[PDB]
Design a protein around this ligand. Structure first.
Ligand SMILES: CC(=O)N[C@@H]1[C@@H](O)[C@H](O)[C@@H](CO)O[C@H]1O
Ligand SMILES: CC(=O)N[C@@H]1[C@@H](O)[C@H](O)[C@@H](CO)O[C@H]1O
Ligand SMILES: CC(=O)N[C@@H]1[C@@H](O)[C@H](O)[C@@H](CO)O[C@H]1O
Ligand SMILES: CC(=O)N[C@@H]1[C@@H](O)[C@H](O)[C@@H](CO)O[C@H]1O
Ligand SMILES: *[C@@H]1O[C@H](CO)[C@@H](O)[C@H](O)[C@H]1NC(C)=O
Ligand SMILES: *[C@@H]1O[C@H](CO)[C@@H](O)[C@H](O)[C@H]1NC(C)=O
Ligand SMILES: [Ca+2]
Ligand SMILES: [Ca+2]
Ligand SMILES: [Ca+2]
Ligand SMILES: [Ca+2]
Ligand SMILES: [Ca+2]
Ligand SMILES: [Ca+2]
Ligand SMILES: [Ca+2]
Ligand SMILES: [Ca+2]
Lengths: 595, 602
């Protein structure tokens, strides 16, 4: 709602693009936050297809960020017969970035790995990897469960089972609250999908430079499945962490399979033991249900809620426009299955739902908020971010704000969206929009929100011929009533330069020269006053006095008086304020005399 | 707790005018708050003590104030045979000022009134008169419920039954939320005392300038009692309103009778029909149990609680058998309303002849923690006897038994600092209720502003027990290896209206039990086991935690391997005394200890 569109933070990257495929907020232990962006198609050791990650300090003007190296070299180790080796060709370092407690985990899902066992070989297959690093410490603990030495003949022998040659671990990187790192591998089990879990502390403990194999304590890998629906399931395409079970103190992983059950799609909730507590499938085939998955409690009830993206949805306008499915967390026995809000974009081929970013209390509204992105939406397919507030009792169905791509067509503005981290540390979380091949990363800063609570004090009714008030000049006896207005500013971090303007309307329904009551001071049927609330918490109530003419004067006495007070922000750069809540009170006064 | 004692506002009246005897907060139509101060001995137009009320607008420096021009003039109106007279000489206009909505009720209890019929009369007795005003419109009105025209001999003929000649109505004035003015006349019904309650709108709409004896049609008065206990009860010395019977439609009055049942003292809680719901007897005779009464929900359970004051309570010390200090009783209302019984808390003063409990002011939520705080004033307490005010914070069970803050008189001795108290109103509009204390001896009022309360939080994490020499990260500036680990402490500062310059200080003491310079655990850097560093939180919802590398001495080097390794994290405000007064109050947990041990084979 309060995300500043007119001013944005622009971060540049390599001319080879991909700067913005994935990104996250690196929360420093000191309390600072900086944006870490993976560019999975930067230059290699010698102009090679590789990845790469940049670390941008949080700023406003922006610029060329420094680069954080993880691993770019074709290693080769001779374990007896097996001369195993790694290949950086199109590794994609930066396709998944997640940060936690001074550690950054950035993945290269398409990194290759071949083991030469004399004549036979393991084939140069994309096992993928995800490299961990504490930039302050400098320690690098690369993690790659799918790296192995089992030669291809063994795979071919029995049933091509328990394979990890092309798992592509790290297609989606997330980290729990405790620091446990979770990685997706869509290609695991012969292009079926597996997951990896390992403590970052344990990963750093068990890692040894040079050697290209380990087990790293009790790292938890997903179970291989022979179910036909899982074939080419593409599990671990997108992952997130949130609390969903009946017990606390445990972190669940939500994983998306956009091709589950013959491109139908699914999303699953897993514990650390991978018990599959809940699984919700898609509705439209080839709609890519699960491309991006987000976890946040926008309802404000505390219990986390689920958002699932289907950018390839074909709306029954059969127009290819994505859709975000919302799932509030209920208190039923087997609840959470039925979706509640189905948000759908407008621009054709917009891919509405490629990036769902939790935002938390974006506008100090008391409920969490979200930002969905359609990378090819908008007027001319540029791509647009749709901010949806909590609003309680569900989610804001309408876009509280629409952020337009300032990038040319095809930049896919809005592929990776992250929020839920107050970058301004002002109770107002910000948003970051990165896009694959964008070459630029945009950051939206939220602005203070002012809720208004408005009340009126007007006499309910009176005799038009009371004749108690006295006109100054003419000295005529007239009836009159007490008109007062009190508007107060609620919310957090309200700016002290507030200049709210209140406009009063007496007999609003009646037109001009059809009006009945009329102000003494200004001789007008309505005025605006600077009812500024800046610099104080108490409401301002400056009254007025409008006279009511004699019976014989007018004839609109049969019409009851309408007293509508409407408060609006001043019209006079960036407003830095968003009026919300009650802003128009129309308490009424009727005319009562005999009939 | 957070009431600033350094920067005070001083509002002055005329010399010897008793400016500050009673006071209340008047809210202007625009929401601007002003103070109504009674000065019950201000010089009248004819150089005589009559009374007066000042309307002090809120400022920073303070000073002189304008006064509400009432009608200070004796009145004489002959209604045919009789001759009604009102004498406004030493009437005490300002002895009880209470502001409700846009009206101010300033009562002169000692205004005299006579009815001259031929030779006879009704005796020139003090009936009292409250003066209602609307300073934004000039609408003046008067209310004298106890005025009568019955000749003196009639009461003698009927045993002084329903004798309302000595009411001094306005001795204690309150206004309910529904706009009903309730006056306690301690001297009504021949000093038994009564309550006179009438709607303010009816008071304004039944007053005609010139008529002295009229009758408000909707007013209600108490019942004269033949029970010997009530005699000379002064029933109406102090009066307050609150909810005590269940139904929120009915409003109940709490009325003090400080000399009920032969100076024993009592407080009666009774509904609008003056049916006694409950009676709270005194504890010690001549203690004036009922001198001050306040109603507020200190414990926050949603039910109003009662605060009684006995300024002349003589406590039973071990050394002194009976010493006059004063005592405030706290009664907590439970469910099942007609069960409020034994007192829940018994606060007692310290200074002799300090009159602890002469004023009980509900402060609202001064600390902003969901519980109601009060102020009890001893006008002659304090080591020098010049006057003290004690702030008591509310909690789940009763309220704090010790004064969170103590305010001392800035005025010379005998100023009666604390006689009049009034609070629970944000005067400067900074989100925190303020307090106004009236020292009529010095003819001044002190305004205390509540500075913001910074609620702190501390979380010092030490990962686990460690081995003496793990031979990890080397000792600083040496290739010599030692055992190293991380110390991380997150400190947060949450509060309302906190300034942008807040910067706490974290004292990190490494095994404070051991003497410094040779502690078992030092830092991997400067090696100083005690490091106090500033951590700024000037508008940061995210606690900031600068991790530190810490070194552990050799197993042979440190010989006490059995003593617990206890790290100390202390949070303190910076030395703001160098500049102006401390702008914040760092209430809350600011000091924690975290203990670990020495592990082996790790
Ligand atoms: C959209 C795009 O790739 N534009 C590039 C630009 O970034 C680069 O600076 C220029 C020269 O290298 O060539 C073009
Ligand atoms: C000039 C002006 O303020 N007009 C107001 C408008 O701003 C407001 O949106 C509308 C609904 O309350 O009422 C009218
Ligand atoms: C008893 C009394 O109040 N005396 C005052 C005195 O303190 C003050 O200095 C003087 C100045 O006007 O007025 C008189
Ligand atoms: C024994 C101990 O740790 N005492 C601390 C010390 O920092 C100081 O006396 C005070 C204010 O900083 O807080 C407490
Ligand atoms: C989580 O809370 C505490 C702290 O870790 C722990 O002792 C407790 O067993 C946990 N609760 C669960 C697992 O339900
Ligand atoms: C209080 O008064 C309201 C008037 O609207 C009434 O509806 C309600 O029943 C009353 N409650 C009682 C008498 O307990
Ligand atoms: Ca859980
Ligand atoms: Ca929920
Ligand atoms: Ca919000
Ligand atoms: Ca922000
Ligand atoms: Ca009641
Ligand atoms: Ca209570
Ligand atoms: Ca409190
Ligand atoms: Ca204040």
């Amino acid at each position: 709602l309060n995300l500043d569109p007119v001013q944005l933070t622009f971060y540049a990257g390599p001319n080879g693009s991909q700067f913005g495929f994935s990104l996250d907020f690196h929360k420093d232990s000191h309390g600072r936050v900086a944006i870490v962006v993976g560019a999975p198609r930067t230059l290699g050791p010698s102009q090679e297809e590789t990845g790469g990650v940049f670390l941008c300090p949080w700023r406003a003007e922006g610029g060329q960020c420094p680069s954080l190296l993880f691993d770019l070299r074709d290693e080769t180790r001779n374990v007896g017969s097996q001369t195993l080796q790694t290949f950086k060709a199109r590794q994609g370092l930066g396709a998944s970035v997640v940060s936690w407690s001074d550690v950054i985990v950035a993945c290269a899902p398409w990194q290759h790995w071949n083991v030469l066992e004399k004549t036979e070989e393991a084939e140069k297959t994309p096992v993928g990897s995800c490299f961990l690093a504490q930039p302050e410490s400098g320690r690098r603990a690369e993690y790659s469960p799918c790296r192995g030495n089992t030669l291809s003949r063994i795979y071919v022998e029995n049933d091509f089972s328990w394979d990890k040659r092309y798992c592509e671990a790290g297609f989606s990187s997330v980290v729990t609250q405790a620091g446990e790192l979770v990685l997706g591998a869509p290609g695991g089990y012969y292009f079926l999908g597996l997951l990896a879990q390992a403590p970052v502390a344990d990963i750093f403990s068990s890692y040894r430079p040079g050697i290209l194999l380990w087990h790293v304590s009790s790292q938890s890998l997903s179970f291989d499945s022979s179910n036909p629906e899982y074939f080419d399931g593409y599990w671990g395409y997108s992952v997130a962490v949130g609390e969903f079970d009946g017990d606390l103190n445990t972190t669940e992983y939500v994983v998306g399979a956009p091709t589950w059950s013959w491109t139908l799609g699914a999303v699953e909730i897993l514990d650390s033991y991978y018990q599959r507590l809940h699984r919700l499938r898609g509705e439209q085939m080839a709609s890519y249900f699960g491309h991006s998955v987000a976890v946040t409690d926008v309802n404000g009830d505390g219990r986390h809620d689920l958002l699932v993206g289907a950018p390839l949805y074909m709306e029954s306008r059969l127009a290819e426009v994505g859709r975000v499915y919302l799932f509030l967390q209920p208190r039923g026995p087997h609840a959470l299955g039925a979706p509640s809000l189905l948000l759908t974009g407008t621009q054709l081929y917009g891919r509405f739902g490629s990036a769902i970013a939790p935002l938390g209390d974006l506008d100090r509204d008391g409920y969490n908020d979200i930002a969905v992105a359609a990378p090819y939406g908008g007027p001319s397919g540029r791509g647009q971010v749709l901010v949806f507030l909590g609003q309680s009792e569900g989610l804001r169905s309408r876009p509280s704000q629409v952020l337009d791509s300032p990038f040319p067509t095809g930049s896919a503005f809005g592929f990776s969206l992250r929020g839920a981290v107050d970058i301004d540390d002002n109770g107002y979380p910000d948003l970051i929009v990165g896009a694959y091949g964008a070459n630029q990363v945009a950051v939206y800063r939220a602005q203070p929100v002012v809720k208004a609570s408005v009340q009126l004090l007007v006499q309910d009714s009176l005799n038009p011929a009371v004749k108690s008030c006295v006109l100054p000049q003419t000295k005529t006896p007239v009836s009159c009533f007490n008109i007062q207005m009190c508007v107060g500013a609620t919310g957090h971090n309200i700016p002290q330069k507030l200049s709210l303007n209140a406009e009063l309307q007496l007999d609003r329904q009646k037109p001009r020269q059809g009006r009945r009551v009329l102000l003494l001071g200004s001789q007008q049927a309505g005025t605006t006053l600077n009812l500024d609330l800046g610099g104080k918490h108490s409401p301002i109530c400056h009254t007025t006095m409008a006279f009511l003419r004699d019976e014989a004067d007018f004839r609109d006495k049969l019409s009851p008086i309408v007293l509508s007070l409407n408060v609006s922000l001043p019209p006079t750069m960036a407003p830095a304020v968003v009026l919300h809540g009650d802003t128009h009170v129309q308490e009424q006064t009727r005319i009562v005399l005999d009939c």
